[PDB]
Design an enzyme around this catalytic site. Structure first.
Site, PDB file in Angstrom:
ATOM      1  N   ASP A  33       0.737 -20.468 -52.343  1.00 34.33           N
ATOM      2  CA  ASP A  33       0.054 -20.953 -53.536  1.00 34.33           C
ATOM      3  C   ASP A  33       0.987 -21.062 -54.736  1.00 34.33           C
ATOM      4  O   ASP A  33       0.806 -21.955 -55.568  1.00 34.33           O
ATOM      5  CB  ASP A  33      -1.175 -20.090 -53.881  1.00 34.33           C
ATOM      6  N   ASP A 422       1.137  -7.744 -58.878  1.00 36.28           N
ATOM      7  CA  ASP A 422       0.343  -7.380 -57.700  1.00 36.28           C
ATOM      8  C   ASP A 422       0.815  -6.118 -56.979  1.00 36.28           C
ATOM      9  O   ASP A 422      -0.016  -5.313 -56.544  1.00 36.28           O
ATOM     10  CB  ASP A 422       0.309  -8.542 -56.702  1.00 36.28           C
TER      11      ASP A 422
HETATM   12  O1  LIG Z   1      -5.185  -5.384 -53.494  1.00 30.35           O
HETATM   13  C1  LIG Z   1      -5.413  -6.555 -52.750  1.00 30.35           C
HETATM   14  C2  LIG Z   1      -6.711  -7.230 -53.120  1.00 30.35           C
HETATM   15  O2  LIG Z   1      -7.695  -6.208 -53.467  1.00 30.35           O
HETATM   16  C3  LIG Z   1      -8.998  -6.835 -53.827  1.00 30.35           C
HETATM   17  O3  LIG Z   1      -9.876  -5.809 -53.983  1.00 30.35           O
HETATM   18  C4  LIG Z   1      -8.808  -7.655 -55.093  1.00 30.35           C
HETATM   19  O4  LIG Z   1     -10.044  -8.260 -55.534  1.00 30.35           O
HETATM   20  C5  LIG Z   1      -7.815  -8.732 -54.851  1.00 30.35           C
HETATM   21  O5  LIG Z   1      -7.525  -9.377 -56.121  1.00 30.35           O
HETATM   22  C6  LIG Z   1      -6.523  -8.262 -54.239  1.00 30.35           C
HETATM   23  O6  LIG Z   1      -5.912  -9.405 -53.629  1.00 30.35           O
HETATM   24  C7  LIG Z   1      -4.799  -9.869 -54.393  1.00 30.35           C
HETATM   25  O7  LIG Z   1      -5.285 -10.657 -55.565  1.00 30.35           O
HETATM   26  C8  LIG Z   1      -4.200 -11.282 -56.331  1.00 30.35           C
HETATM   27  C9  LIG Z   1      -4.849 -12.082 -57.431  1.00 30.35           C
HETATM   28  O8  LIG Z   1      -5.662 -11.171 -58.137  1.00 30.35           O
HETATM   29  C10 LIG Z   1      -6.459 -11.822 -59.150  1.00 30.35           C
HETATM   30  O9  LIG Z   1      -7.261 -12.955 -58.578  1.00 30.35           O
HETATM   31  C11 LIG Z   1      -8.359 -12.481 -57.711  1.00 30.35           C
HETATM   32  C12 LIG Z   1      -9.214 -11.377 -58.324  1.00 30.35           C
HETATM   33  O10 LIG Z   1     -10.029 -10.835 -57.280  1.00 30.35           O
HETATM   34  C13 LIG Z   1      -8.386 -10.279 -58.925  1.00 30.35           C
HETATM   35  O11 LIG Z   1      -9.275  -9.335 -59.582  1.00 30.35           O
HETATM   36  C14 LIG Z   1      -7.348 -10.801 -59.869  1.00 30.35           C
HETATM   37  O12 LIG Z   1      -6.528  -9.715 -60.336  1.00 30.35           O
HETATM   38  C15 LIG Z   1      -3.292 -12.118 -55.427  1.00 30.35           C
HETATM   39  O13 LIG Z   1      -2.176 -12.513 -56.214  1.00 30.35           O
HETATM   40  C16 LIG Z   1      -2.774 -11.299 -54.275  1.00 30.35           C
HETATM   41  O14 LIG Z   1      -1.936 -12.144 -53.443  1.00 30.35           O
HETATM   42  C17 LIG Z   1      -3.878 -10.671 -53.494  1.00 30.35           C
HETATM   43  O15 LIG Z   1      -3.353  -9.744 -52.520  1.00 30.35           O
END
Ligand SMILES: OC[C@H]1O[C@@H](O)[C@H](O)[C@@H](O)[C@@H]1O[C@@H]1O[C@H](CO[C@H]2OC[C@@H](O)[C@H](O)[C@H]2O)[C@@H](O)[C@H](O)[C@H]1O
Ligand code: NA
Length: 707
Positions: A33, A422
């Site tokens: 991405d 992250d």
């Molecule tokens: O820790 C991994 C994973 O945990 C989930 O509980 C969380 O919701 C998720 O965001 C995490 O996955 C990563 O997310 C980031 C992007 O994060 C942002 O966009 C999605 C939202 O759900 C988040 O709250 C926000 O911070 C990605 O860059 C990672 O690649 C991915 O692992």
């Protein structure tokens, strides 16, 4: 002129697509991405980044919204490149290669794509006709369906595909913003065609709660909704088909944000039959989960893989069926994972499995993506637990996808300490071997990191905690060069973590500016805080490396330079304009005090070029077209000025540069093939002459040395 190497981390970001070539064993590709595409090279046993030639003007093509190969031509590769659809982002492009991504030609499109937006893991939106490779189709996010009949060199809208088909194909992301998701996939039914003539039957999935599956019987001339389809959920993938059964994964959101429901459907067009075949049901109450992806064994049409998405009851699972969806077995729970390649993955959990693929030459070999890289099975057919457990390895050599936010090369200790999106960051004991993350408390983002100029064992970093609900302290300090850490005793009374942090030359004072908080001073790591006197809240503070009494500040909003001679208790405006910083991943002023001389500061900004602040005077050293990111390191020759490194534009040409004459003349040290878009956090090494590190917005950290 330099040799560029990746700092070894191992994946680290969301891989949004994986693809094997059915015409050549060992040939595969991955799209990401934020970080371009990759070709797996069986001869070197690595992924090879295919888009590091992207220059600074083309940063937005690093997001790869879709990709496709020609089943009849193992040399062809097509990438749909385009990261954002907002105003500051350019139009998208199809990058076409006929040497497996060695070189590309560019077809500019009249719409934008969403490589790093919602629906990015739906696929594949781009497809090659399996009977006439001259024909490609591309599903957009907000502009209907587009077609090429000259191998992707030119594109025209499929006028018969209605724009209204994308009605409702938008969704909110995690921070509340609506995004155009549009088409999820374009699938040719190869069983409907014959060699040499365009394939008659074509499926188009739309990421919408309304009619989400369309089909053409006449090579795209007319379009109809598939009869009997389910509505209310959003499809993300459509697989299989060779035996007359298609497999479609659905979620209640496009993904990756916010999925909390979904389904798995088997579709048999000859019978007009739809059957729900989800391995496990949704919860009766509480949040559900999505089906993130489905794949079919290329050699065995009744063999399926299907992943949950945002299942937190307790965690995600990947399921296998060998009888077309009638029965399933869980795969990961009882499996063995090898973390020796990236030791930090032992503390990660497989999640965001939005894409799957099975080796068309070996059913034992399957890939699934995560939000931190790719896993690959060795014995998917042959395992029998517990004595012969399914084995997964982290097939990510050569693949580096982190977005660093700050970098530090201290006067002693490790040569590099990182602050990363992250995954927090690492003390890089070896740059060519992957590490464990910082010991002690765990941050989500590492945002800012710094070390005492004259006591480099004292390190401080700040960052974020995602979904913060227990008052986690977002600044941390180490006294052993980042080997072990302790949280600050408290945060300052204003702001929301992250921001920028700095530590004085003798480690006695820290200045932390939390996001929206202004600058706060502590001499006891957060037991007490005082607001720094004489700075606006938008100032960013840097410490002198030699004299603990000296600190400096640039107001990012105004470009004014401030100075402190009382250990950062207070600052005076110097009267001097140094320019506002370039907007980057983290807009930060480029202010670099001399590691070896008290009161000598090197500065850079797009507006003013490269400057030296010394003895109450600003000297303009040079005026490049755009001086974006500045670093300082050891002089190449003893007695000479410190080396300076610059990412920016010099005489119309973007790249990374070094000055050996104190910032008056610059020499390009990378080449077009190693531009990586818009490098930032340019960081010299005070111990190694010629060494420079820099961050990239999705290809990780790089380091270079001459020759
Ligand atoms: O820790 C991994 C994973 O945990 C989930 O509980 C969380 O919701 C998720 O965001 C995490 O996955 C990563 O997310 C980031 C992007 O994060 C942002 O966009 C999605 C939202 O759900 C988040 O709250 C926000 O911070 C990605 O860059 C990672 O690649 C991915 O692992
Ligand atoms: Na820093």
């Amino acid at each position: 002129p330099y040799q560029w190497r990746s700092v070894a981390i191992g994946g680290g970001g969301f891989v949004t697509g994986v693809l094997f070539h059915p015409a050549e064993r060992g040939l595969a590709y991955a799209r990401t991405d934020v970080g371009g595409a990759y070709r797996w090279d069986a001869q070197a046993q690595q992924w090879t980044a295919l888009t590091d030639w992207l220059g600074a003007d083309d940063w937005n093509l690093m997001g790869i919204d879709a990709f496709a190969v020609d089943p009849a031509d193992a040399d062809a590769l097509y990438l749909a490149a385009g990261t954002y659809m907002h105003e500051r982002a350019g139009n998208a492009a199809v990058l076409r290669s006929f040497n497996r991504g060695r070189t590309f030609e560019r077809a500019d499109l009249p719409f934008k794509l969403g490589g790093n937006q919602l629906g990015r893991a739906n696929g594949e939106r781009l497809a090659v006709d399996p009977h006439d490779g001259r024909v490609l189709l591309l599903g957009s996010r907000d502009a209907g369906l587009w077609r090429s009949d000259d191998r992707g060199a030119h594109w025209a809208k499929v006028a018969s595909f209605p724009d209204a088909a994308l009605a409702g194909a938008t969704a909110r992301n995690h921070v509340g913003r609506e995004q155009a998701v549009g088409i999820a996939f374009v699938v040719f039914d190869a069983a409907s065609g014959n060699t040499g003539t365009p394939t008659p039957r074509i499926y188009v999935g739309v990421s919408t709660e309304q009619t989400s599956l369309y089909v053409s019987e006449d090579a795209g001339r007319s379009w109809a909704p598939v009869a009997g389809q389910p509505r209310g959920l959003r499809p993300s993938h459509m697989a299989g088909g060779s035996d007359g059964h298609w497999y479609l994964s659905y979620g209640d959101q496009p993904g990756p944000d916010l999925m909390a429901g979904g389904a798995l459907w088997k579709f048999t067009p000859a019978q007009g039959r739809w059957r729900e075949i989800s391995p496990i049901p949704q919860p009766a109450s509480g949040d559900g989960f999505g089906w993130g992806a489905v794949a079919v064994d290329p050699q065995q049409p009744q063999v399926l893989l299907a992943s949950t998405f945002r299942r937190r009851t307790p965690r995600d699972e990947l399921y296998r069926s060998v009888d077309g969806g009638k029965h399933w077995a869980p795969l990961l729970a009882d499996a063995v994972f090898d973390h020796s390649a990236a030791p930090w993955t032992a503390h990660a959990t497989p999640h965001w499995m939005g894409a799957l693929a099975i080796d068309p030459f070996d059913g034992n070999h399957a890939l699934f993506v995560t939000g931190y890289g790719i896993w690959a099975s060795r014995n998917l057919q042959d395992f029998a637990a517990p004595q012969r457990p399914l084995q997964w390895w982290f097939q990510d050599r050569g693949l580096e996808e982190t977005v660093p936010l700050d970098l530090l090369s201290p006067m002693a200790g490790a040569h590099l300490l990182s602050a990363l999106g992250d995954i927090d960051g690492f003390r890089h004991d070896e740059l060519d071997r992957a590490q464990l993350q910082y010991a002690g408390p765990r941050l989500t983002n590492g945002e800012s990191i710094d070390a005492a100029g004259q006591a480099p064992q004292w390190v401080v970093r700040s960052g974020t905690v995602r979904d913060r609900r227990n008052n986690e302290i977002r600044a941390l300090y180490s006294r052993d060069g980042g080997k072990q850490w302790t949280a600050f005793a408290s945060e300052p009374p204003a702001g929301q973590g992250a921001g920028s942090i700095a530590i004085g030359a003798d480690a006695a004072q820290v200045v932390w500016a939390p996001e929206r908080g202004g600058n706060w001073r502590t001499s006891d790591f957060g037991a007490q805080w005082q607001r720094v006197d004489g700075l606006p809240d938008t100032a960013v503070v840097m410490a002198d490396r030699v004299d603990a009494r000296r600190w400096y500040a640039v107001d990012v909003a105004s470009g004014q330079l401030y100075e402190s001679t009382d250990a950062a208790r207070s600052f005076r405006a110097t009267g001097v304009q140094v320019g506002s910083p370039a907007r980057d991943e983290r807009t930060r002023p480029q202010l670099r005090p001399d590691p070896w001389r008290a009161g000598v500061v090197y500065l850079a900004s797009p507006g003013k070029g490269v400057m030296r602040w010394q003895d109450g005077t600003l000297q303009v050293l040079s005026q490049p077209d755009e001086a974006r990111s500045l670093g300082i390191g050891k002089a190449l020759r003893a007695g000479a000025p410190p080396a300076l490194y610059l990412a920016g534009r010099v005489q119309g040409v973007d790249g990374v540069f070094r000055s050996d004459d104190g910032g008056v003349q610059w020499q390009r040290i990378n080449d077009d093939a190693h531009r990586f878009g818009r490098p930032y956090s340019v960081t010299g090494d005070p111990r190694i002459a010629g060494r420079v590190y820099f961050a990239t917005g999705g290809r990780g950290i790089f380091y270079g040395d001459p020759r």
